[PDB]
Amino acid sequence: SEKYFVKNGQPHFLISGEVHYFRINPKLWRNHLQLLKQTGADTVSTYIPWDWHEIEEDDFDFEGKTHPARNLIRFIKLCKEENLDLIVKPGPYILAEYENQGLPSWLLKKLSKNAFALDENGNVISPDLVSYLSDEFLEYTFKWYDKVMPIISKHQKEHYGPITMMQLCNEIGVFQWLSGKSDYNPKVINLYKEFIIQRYKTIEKLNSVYSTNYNSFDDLKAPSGKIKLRSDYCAYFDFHLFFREYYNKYISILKNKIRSFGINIKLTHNIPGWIYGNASELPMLISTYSEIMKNHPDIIFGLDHIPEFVSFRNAHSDLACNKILEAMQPEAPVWAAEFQAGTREHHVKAYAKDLETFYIASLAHGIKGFNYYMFSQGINPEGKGFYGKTFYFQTALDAASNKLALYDSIKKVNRFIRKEQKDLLRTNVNSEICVGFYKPYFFTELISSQLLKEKKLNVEELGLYIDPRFLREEILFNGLLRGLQTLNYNYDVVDLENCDLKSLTAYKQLWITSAEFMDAETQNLLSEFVLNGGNLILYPAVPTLDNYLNRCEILKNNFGIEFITKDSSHKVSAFGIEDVFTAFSKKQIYNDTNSKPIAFTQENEICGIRKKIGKGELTILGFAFGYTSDEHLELIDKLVKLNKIKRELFVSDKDIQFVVRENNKSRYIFFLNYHNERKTFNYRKSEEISIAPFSYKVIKENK
Amino acid sequence: SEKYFVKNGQPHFLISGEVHYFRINPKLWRNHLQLLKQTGADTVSTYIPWDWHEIEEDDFDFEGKTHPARNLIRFIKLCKEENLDLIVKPGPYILAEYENQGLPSWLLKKLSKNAFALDENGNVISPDLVSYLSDEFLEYTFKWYDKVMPIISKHQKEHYGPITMMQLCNEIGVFQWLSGKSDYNPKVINLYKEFIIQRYKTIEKLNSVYSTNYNSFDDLKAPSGKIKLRSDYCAYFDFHLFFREYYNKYISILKNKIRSFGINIKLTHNIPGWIYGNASELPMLISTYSEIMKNHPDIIFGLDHIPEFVSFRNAHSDLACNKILEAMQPEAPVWAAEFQAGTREHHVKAYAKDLETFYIASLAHGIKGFNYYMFSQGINPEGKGFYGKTFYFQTALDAASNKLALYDSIKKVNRFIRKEQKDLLRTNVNSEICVGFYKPYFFTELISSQLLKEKKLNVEELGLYIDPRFLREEILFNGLLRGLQTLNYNYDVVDLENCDLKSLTAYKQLWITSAEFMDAETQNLLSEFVLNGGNLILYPAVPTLDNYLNRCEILKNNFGIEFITKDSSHKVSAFGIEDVFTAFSKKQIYNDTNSKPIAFTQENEICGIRKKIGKGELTILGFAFGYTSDEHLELIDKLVKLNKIKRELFVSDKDIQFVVRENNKSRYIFFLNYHNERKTFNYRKSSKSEEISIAPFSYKVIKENK
Ligand SMILES: CCCCCCCCO[C@@H]1O[C@H](CO)[C@@H](O)[C@H](O)[C@H]1O
Ligand SMILES: CCCCCCCCO[C@@H]1O[C@H](CO)[C@@H](O)[C@H](O)[C@H]1O
Ligand SMILES: [Ca+2]
């Protein structure tokens, strides 16, 4: 049933600690590895920075000849002597606050103009930022792989060495994201052209989808500027599809080159998206990897969790991210490639007592492995730090291997995990709620994001009112997912693309947060789901367009739905709940023939209905609510109770979060107190306990 | 000579609680007032919502004829009976999560399009957002004042009623700010044109300042779209000056109207700017009030503090905001018109254990009065709730007048304040550091802000590299002010406009965070300050332009500075601290003439110097640093130590914040732990050491008799 790492043919919780040899006094390398092993960690993780080892063009030092901390060979030997497995990450990009993001200075000085990412004007976006598929950049990357990969091959677990996993590059696309800007390098734009021709075959086919008027593919230009026309939305949508193929090509080139050295260990990649201690944009970033994950079943994606604190303000972020990774990668364990330990930022404090709770909550929220980032603080050698002298603060160990407060928290959590991993790794939550992941709503990193300065997407200019990023951030991430977690209802997330009908039928309810557009495949899937006996909850709109904003009303017509879009007060009543605040004046007003009306505008117009269709049930709400009032929790609760779904526990205090994890033999009840209040409460199945502020309690039951 | 409220010629700590009569069962009004009084609160505060009392056009109910909770008269009477003074806030805007922000539905339905705030295209920004000087808006506001003001007048203190203060409207500009669009209503356009003609007199004079070629004033439009030329920047700068005069006109019109009813009580206004539990944009909004605060000494501005949590993430916001209000309103006490009690929104928790610490920190940080907002929860009658039925959560009292957890925290704090107010209100901190408040850097709400939809200001397009909003947020608010508070160095903030040299010479150091532009008046003042014996710290730029980005090299010349702007690594060395990360590749490179070089680029070029000029000392750093690394705190500490400035206490844990307040008689030591760690530390006055244990997110106060 569950996916989990294995060691000695038993379920193994992967406990890795990040220790940057290149930022640590080599006299203290053994001491760091021993103190890490002494927490019950089984693995150590590090970058192998290209800049640090190719000290000049075609001058490699992996042996400490030119600086003791260039002795990668001895660090590998120390990992073996101290019985730690090793995760190695040779880039080419490492980021990691290393100057040039890990690329050599000699390389960046020597590359042509056309090797760099370019803005719509052909100007260099950043003196650190190459275009991934630059021939020059791949030439030098390959010459770097030519020296480091034989070292990694020799020490891989497949040759009985310590290296169990290797990360390819680092957070692909994170620069396109953090910078406003997309890459318009002429090589990238040529690949975009091949992609479009391959996709549409003829300009007449493209023209009928885009409503364009090209005489050939030679008239086709990469999209840029604000979207003003539906044709510009279409161009930008395919520009999004192209970049997912682009990142897949980049990672495929790295992988093929790696495999050519006989390296047969587990390959990895790491997902960015946390900022300011929430992860509402991480679903957009994980959507950029959609083609990699379809095409590479052997690359395990891990999450880069950066909570910064642990409270009701960010409690839902790590669960929603873990669940979305499970949706996109069901055949591999959910794990954190980077799992916050200390802080990257001196002024952004990371409290041991905060992180200890985050670690336990991560177990409740289904994590199967992590790498404490950073277990060990580093000191940047020879001004090679992007920022100051010091790399991370409030870690488990300082750069000189002094134990800090987090050390004892990590030892405590690891001791719990080692005691329980055999049973805990084989547990799941009983989810009767499925929440649909509709990937095209997330495909906006070029036109609409929290990090993009000027918005290229204003849906009002396209005759639309439901913005897909507002939907996926406020209605889905901070709304429905946050609400179900707060109400202690288990949900699973399912990717709707090429989705098996049989994999929706296990759930008593499927929840779809829908904009006005949705592809024919998904409209067909949801139609079949209800017709065959599924209970669907759909809001805030029955879709009437496809991803190209061409008419598509399959779901509408299959369900016998008619509506007019009409302006009204933001407040509606729904299931007898008065003053439900909704995001939009514009609401769908439903013909109620063969329907039960269950929501009403201030002027008593029908803005929600329930209906039987074939063997199934439909609940449509023509209005958008997130979680910004107690009425919103009341409405989510009412909806869940339409199909008689129960919480696993009665807990006397509604502000206590719990997760029940079980198999046939074992149950774990995780109680999580995300609040600055000592809480005393009791519980019983669908008895009294005190939890400190920002704290936890774990309870075992034999079934 | 602290500024504090006075009662019976004694120091009086203003303790108010907010209780919305219109959202509470009137059978429970008395119980809310009694329970508030029993916390030691002296005052109660409420809106009087226009929408609630003008139930239809020209149909008024202040007596509970149509709804018991419309009996404003009886609520006023109960405040008197329960020995509470009363703050009334009749709008016209109240916001307060009330439908249409307090404006009548019938009004918003009746008003013509020209009553509304309009974008650049002439479209309504929001259906509830009126243009402040709309003829139609002020006509209906006046008719609302015609009915509510005679009642307020009759129930003033001077007529033996309970009413001691009235707020004019609510957070002027907050609605425009949150909408992300500025008002281009034609009243605004026409008033701006009059402002520009009055300012420049002739199109030739405006052309010479802006470098434009207009044939007449008729060719000039209110600026719209992005700034691409220095002439666009000039136009926007005058538009900012115009908006400060526009808000002054609004509040003058309301004030003159109020005075005509024989209302002589203290008038208030309330400062917005906290969002997501920080206040780094509050300085921009308070700056929109600069002309109000110069023309109306009888209007007391108070802060609206919404911290939402109390941790290192936001510890610096309340002190910086208290200090900035003091800088702009030096003759009135610092007080909080709205002082967070519970939470306005269910999904953002307000813990008693956080807010109790915020209250104590506020005393440490010099607050002299506050109004707990919300003391009492409300339930919206008749669908009047903008966002839902319940108004506020986790308050002192639920809507039914049950005590909640916060009630005990407020009772504890108030008990300390009543015991200590006589000394505590007269206490000062010993600030040897003054930080300059240069208001023109904050004049960007039309072109650059956290909330503005459109980024109109890109200084690189003007041949500049120091963005004034980046400066005032990262280098000043989240940088220097945060770093000083974290290092436990007391600082004052002084408004540099029309600033007395006499009121800077008190300090050991004056710190100026400077962009490439600064007006002649300020450049001269800082010149005189150093020549006459002041110690100036100036970074990241010697300015060379005025506020219109024309040549002004007064300070550069007076200080005998030569510099070239050159690109280098972000990292510099300063005062022997290596790998100080700085914000810009571009830095000021100084030559070594009659100076001690104390900072060096990665190529060892001089990007900071110290020199003696007349009787004073100058330290210039040609690079930008806030507080984003440990080196930044080391650098701030090094700079403070240049003039032998010392902390009040040796404390063994550098992460403990403290404030020492004293007068002749009394010393209060405030310890604040903004961290999620139980801390055990020792301390001593810098003159055996005492041991203290402090819980997470907690406080200790020690009183000493001198
Ligand atoms: C545009 C300049 C890029 C330099 C910074 C790149 C790396 C910063 O670090 C990145 O920060 C993101 C935001 O918090 C996180 O989501 C990522 O996990 C993290 O690696
Ligand atoms: C665009 C619609 C705006 C309607 C008015 C909403 C007023 C919300 O309330 C305001 O929020 C601000 C941001 O936290 C605070 O700074 C203010 O103090 C507070 O009054
Ligand atoms: Ca029908």
Among the listed residues A264, A133, A136, the one whose alpha carbon sits nearest the alpha carbon of residue A195: A133
Q: Please name the residues in contact with A201: beta carbons below 8 A apart, sequence gap of 6 or more.
A: none
What's the angle, vertex CA B666, arms to CA B665 and CA B667, rounded to 5?
140
Nearest to B472 by CA among B320, B607, B330: B320
How many angstroms separate the CA of residue A53 from the nearest CA in chain B?
Answer: 22
Going by C-alpha positions, the residue among B250, B235, B227 that lies closest to residue B93 is B250
Q: Are residues A618 and A480 in the same domain?
A: yes
Residue in A with minimal Cα distance to B581: A387
Integer CA distances (angstroms), A628 to A96, A636, A658, in order: 36, 12, 21
Is A566:A551 a contact under the CB 8 Å cutoff?
Answer: no
Whether residues B327 and B363 share a domain: the answer is yes
* Intra-chain end-to-end CA distance of chain A, in Å: 18
Domain annotation covers residue B123:
yes
Integer Cα distance of B690 and B652 in angstroms: 10
Instruction: Tell me the C-alpha distance between A142 and A60, whole Å.
Output: 14
Burial class (CB in 10 A: 0-12, 13-18, 19+), B411: middle
Q: Mark the breaks in chain A: residue after which each occurs, C to N over 2.5 Å.
A: 686
Which of B311, B349, B388 lies nearest to residue A631, judging by beta carbons? B388
- Our measurement of the distance from residue A291's CA atom to the centroid of its chain's CA atoms, rounded to an integer in Å, reads 15
The verdict on residue A578 lying in a domain is: yes
* Calpha distance B440→B449 (Å, rounded): 14
Joined together, the tokens standing for residue A25 give 């006094």
Same domain for A487 and A402: no
DSSP, collapsed to helix, strand or coil, labels residue A673 as strand
Q: Tell me, yes or no, whether A106 lies in a domain.
A: no
C-alpha to C-alpha distance for B576 and B563, rounded to whole angstroms: 22
Picking from A354, A370, A356, the residue whose alpha carbon sits closest to that of residue A412 is A356
- The minimum-distance atom of ligand 1 relative to the CA of A275 is 14
**Contact present, A494 and A434 (Cβ < 8 Å):** yes
**Is residue A178 a contact partner of residue A445, using CB atoms and an 8 Å limit?**
no
Paired residues of A309 in beta bridges: none
Contact B628 A675 (CB under 8 A): no
Strand, helix or coil for residue A432: coil
A623 contacts A587 by C-beta, under 8 angstroms: yes
Task: For B491-521, give one letter per residue: b (16+ CB within 10 A) or e.
Answer: bbbbbbbebeeeebeebebbbbbbbbbbbee
What is the spatial distance between Cα A534 and Cα A527, in angstroms, rounded to a whole number?
A: 9
Neighbour tally for B487: CB within 10 Å: 16
Q: Which two tokens stand for residue B559?
A: 């200080």
Nearest CA to ligand 1 atom 14: A275
Q: How many CA atoms lie within 13 A of A241 on its CB side?
A: 14
- Catalytic site residue from A54, A82, A308, A338: A338
Give the residue numbers spanning the domain of B197. 6-424
Nearest alpha carbon to residue A309 among A273, A278, A347, A272: A278
List the 517-556 stretch of B: residues with Cβ below 8 A of A.
Answer: none
Q: Is B704 helix (H, G, I), strand (E, B) or coil?
A: strand
**Which residues of B are marked as active site?**
171, 338
How many domains does the structure of chain A reveal? 3
Nearest to B272 by CA among B219, B210, B337: B337
| Per-window interface: A 557-596 vs B, CB < 8 A | 570-571, 578-581
Q: Is B450 on the interface with A (CB under 8 A)?
A: no
In one letter, which amino acid is A335? W
Give Cβ neighbours of residue A544 (< 8 Å, ≥ 6 apart).
Answer: A516, A517, A551, A552, A553, A556
Task: List the one residue out of A329, A338, A257 whose CA is nearest residue A300.
Answer: A329
Q: How many CB atoms lie within 10 A of CB A399?
A: 22
Binning chain A into helix, strand and coil, the percentages to the nearest 5 are 35, 25, 40
Output DSSP code: residue B689: P
CB atoms within 10 A of CB B702: 14
Angle between helix A230-259 and helix A135-154 axes, rounded to 10 deg = 40
Scored b (16 or more CB within 10 A) or e, A435-468 reads: bbbbbbbbbbbbbbbebbeebbbebeebebbbbb
Distance CA A488, CA B12 (A): 48
Here the tokens at position B342 are 């519970």
**Closest-lying ligand to the alpha carbon of B338?**
2
Burial B270-280 (b: 16+ CB within 10 A, else e): bbbbbbebbbb
Q: Rounded to whole angstroms, how far apart are CA atoms B260 and A12?
A: 80
Token pair 């970033």 is found at: A285
Q: What's the token pair of residue A384? A: 């090679």
- Token pair, residue A598, equals 């269950």
Which residues of chain B neighbour A453 with C-beta distances below 8 Å?
455
**Main-chain dihedrals φ then ψ at residue A492, nearest 5 degrees:** -110, 150
Of A351, A578, A694, the CB nearest to B389: A578
Phi and psi torsions of B127, nearest 5°: -60, -15
B1 within domain boundaries: no
Show the tokens assigned to A309.
Answer: 């604190």
Residues 6+ apart with CB under 8 A from A55: A61, A66, A70
- Identify whether residues B221 and B149 lie together within a single domain: yes
Which phi and psi (to 5°) does residue A376 adopt?
A: -115, 125
Which of B346, B388, B675 minimises the CB distance to A351?
A: B675
Distance CA B300, CA B323 (A): 15
Residue B465, both tokens: 């590299």
Nearest to B387 among A349, A387, A581 (CB): A581
Confirm whether residue B221 is marked as ligand binding. no
- Enumerate residues 6+ apart whose C-beta is below 8 A from A529: A501, A504, A505, A510, A536, A616
Answer yes or no: do A567 and A696 share one domain. Answer: no
- Whether the CB-CB separation of A292 and A253 falls below 8 Å is answered with no
- What is the distance in angstroms between the CA of the first residue and the CA of the last residue of chain B? 19
Residues B167 and B277 in one domain: yes
Of the candidates B696, B142, B605, B338, the one whose C-alpha atom is nearest the C-alpha of residue A695 is B696
Resolution of the experimental model, in Å, one decimal:
1.9
CA distance A445 to A469: 10
Experiment type? X-ray
Specify the 3-state DSSP secondary structure of A261: coil
Strand (E) or helix (H) holding A613: strand A606-613
- Is residue A502 within 8 Å of residue A476, measured between CB atoms? no
d(CA A332, CA A325): 10
Neighbours of A501 (CB within 10 A): 12
Q: Minimal CA–CA distance to A45: which of A5, A74, A4, A14?
A: A14
Instruction: Provide the residue type at B206 as one letter.
Output: L
CATH number at residue B139: 3.20.20.80
Beta-bridge partners for A587? A566
Separation CA B319–CA B362 (nearest Å): 8
Residues A397 and A270 in one domain: yes
Sign of CA pseudo-dihedral A57, A61, A66, A67: positive
DSSP string for A510-537: EEEEE-SB--HHHHHHHHHHHHTT-EEE
A602 vs B384: CA distance, rounded Å: 12
**Alpha carbon distance A33, A284 (integer Å):** 36
Q: Which two tokens stand for residue B634?
A: 């080391």
CB A370 within 8 A of CB A15: yes
SS3 readout for B157-201:
HHHCCCEEEEECCCCCCHHHHHHCCCCCCHHHHHHHHHHHHHHHC
Burial of A77 (0-12, 13-18, 19+ CB in 10 A): middle
Asked if residues A500 and A507 have their Cβ atoms less than 8 Å apart, the reply is no
- How is residue B481 annotated by DSSP? I
Is B617 within 8 Å of B535 (Cβ atoms)?
yes
Cα–Cα distance for residue pair A688/A264, rounded to 1 Å: 52
Domain assignment of residue A210, yes or no: no
Which neighbouring-strand residues pair with B18? B45
**d(C-alpha A151, C-alpha A76), whole Å:** 10
Burial class (CB in 10 A: 0-12, 13-18, 19+), B378: buried
Structure tokens, A329? 């990668």
User: Does residue A240 form part of some domain?
Assistant: no
Name the minimum distance, in Å, from the CA of A649 to any CA of chain B. Answer: 22
Are A11 and A425 a contacting pair, CB within 8 Å?
A: yes
Alpha-carbon span B256 to B138, nearest angstrom: 13
Look up residue A237 and give its two tokens: 């949508």
Cα A296 to averaged position of ligand 1 atoms, centre (Å): 25
Return the sign of the alpha-carbon dihedral for residues A226, A227, A228, A231. positive
Task: Verify cis geometry, omega within 30 degrees of 0, for the bond prior to B92.
Answer: yes
Inter-residue contact A335 to A370 (CB < 8 Å):
yes
Report which secondary-structure segment, H or E, holds A486.
Answer: helix A482-486
CB B262 within 8 A of CB B151: no
Give CA torsion, residues A138, A139, A140, A146, to 10 deg: 100
Please answer whether residues B375 and B408 qualify as being in contact, where contact means their C-beta atoms are separated by less than 8 angstroms: no
Contact yes or no for B419/B438 (Cβ under 8 A): no
Beta-carbon neighbours within 5 Å of ion ligand 3 = A 560, 593
Task: Name the region of A576 (left: φ>0; alpha: ψ -120 to 50; beta: rest).
Answer: left
Helices (H), B111-173: 135-154
Ramachandran assignment for B678, one of left (phi > 0), alpha (psi -120 to 50 degrees), beta (any other):
beta
Closest alpha carbon to A480 in A452, A518, A513: A513
Identity (one letter) of the amino acid at A593?
A: T
**Cβ pair B166, B209 in contact under 8 A:** no
Phi, psi of A555 (to 5 degrees): -65, -50
Give the H or E element holding residue B434.
strand B433-437
Q: What is the CATH number of the domain that holds A678?
A: 2.60.40
- B47 lies in the same domain as B194: yes
Cis bond upstream, residue B540 (ω within 30): yes
With a CB cutoff of 8 Å and minimum separation 6, the contacts of A702 are: A665, A666, A667
Residue window 153-212, chain B: list those with CB within 8 Å of chain A.
none
Give me the amino acid identity at B38. Answer: Q
Cα A616 to Cα A611: distance, rounded to the nearest angstrom: 9
**Segment 627-656 of chain B within 8 Å of chain A by CB:** 627-633
Distance of alpha carbon A408 from alpha carbon B112, whole angstroms: 67
Which chain B residues touch A353 with a CB distance below 8 Å?
A: 676-677, 696
Q: What are A682's two structure tokens?
A: 């009791």
- B647 contacts B494 by C-beta, under 8 angstroms: no
Q: Which of A374, A401, A424 is the last residue of a domain?
A: A424
- ∠ CA B539-B543-B545, rounded to 5°: 160
Are A34 and A26 in contact by the 8 Å Cβ rule? The answer is: no
Under 8 Å between Cβ of B589 and B607: yes
Measure in Å the smallest separation between the Cα of A352 and chain B Cα atoms: 8
CA dihedral A675, A678, A681, A685 (to 10 degrees): 50
Phi, psi of A308 (to 5 degrees): 70, -35
Minimal CA separation from A388 to chain B, in Å: 5
Q: Are residues A158 and A56 in the same domain?
A: yes
| Residue bearing the CA closest to ligand 2, atom 16 | B273
Closest approach atom of ligand 2 to CA B276? 14
In this structure, are residues B526 and B541 in contact, taking their beta carbons and an 8 Å threshold? no
Task: Please say which residue of B397, B424, B451 terminates a domain.
Answer: B424
Q: Phi and psi (nearest 5°) for A190?
A: -60, -45
Please give the DSSP secondary-structure letter assigned to residue B696: T
Q: Domain for residue A256, yes or no?
A: no
Same domain, A510 and A403: no
Pocket test for ligand 2, best of B89, B94, B116, B171 (most atoms within 8 A of CB): B171
* CB neighbour list of residue A389: distance below 8 Å, 6 or more residues apart: A379, A380, B578, B579, B631
Distance A632 CA to ligand 3 centre (A): 28
Place of tokens 């209800």: A530
Distance CA A114, CA A525 (A): 44
Per the document, the length of chain B is 706
A637, burial (CB in 10 Å: exposed 0-12, middle 13-18, buried 19+): middle
CB A200 within 8 A of CB A209: yes
Start-end of H helices in B593-653: 630-641
Do B10 and B84 have their domain in common?
yes
What are the structure tokens assigned to B540, written together?
């990241």
CATH number for the domain harbouring residue A616? 3.40.50.880
A104, A137 contact by CB (below 8 A): no
**A410, A457: one domain:** no
Centre of ligand 3 to C-alpha A558, Å, is 10
Contact between B454 and A454 using a beta-carbon 8 Å cutoff = yes
- Distance in angstroms (rounded) separating the CA atoms of residues B356 and B362: 10
Q: Which of B585, B616, B641 is the last residue of a domain?
A: B641
- Please report whether residue A331 resides in a domain: yes
Q: At what angle do helices B230-259 and B186-200 cross, to 10 degrees?
A: 110
- The CA distances from residue B523 to B186, B520, B546, B559, B608, in Å, are 37, 5, 9, 10, 19
Residues in chain A: 703
d(CA B117, CA B119): 7
DSSP secondary structure, A569-584, as one string: -SEEEETTEEEEE-S-
| Residue A594: partners with Cβ closer than 8 Å, 6 or more residues away | A560, A611
Contact A92, A144 (CB under 8 A): yes
Which long-range CB contacts under 8 A does B544-547 form with residues at least 24 apart?
B544/B516, B545/B516, B545/B517, B545/B518, B546/B517, B546/B518, B546/B519, B546/B520, B547/B237, B547/B440, B547/B517, B547/B518, B547/B519
- From the list B509, B470, B466, the residue with the least C-alpha distance to B491 is B509
**Cβ neighbours of residue A282 closer than 8 Å, sequence gap 6 or more:** A271, A272, A273, A274, A303, A317, A321, A324
Q: Give the count of beta carbons closer than 10 Å to the beta carbon of residue A572.
A: 26
**Look-up: residue for tokens 């339409």?**
A642
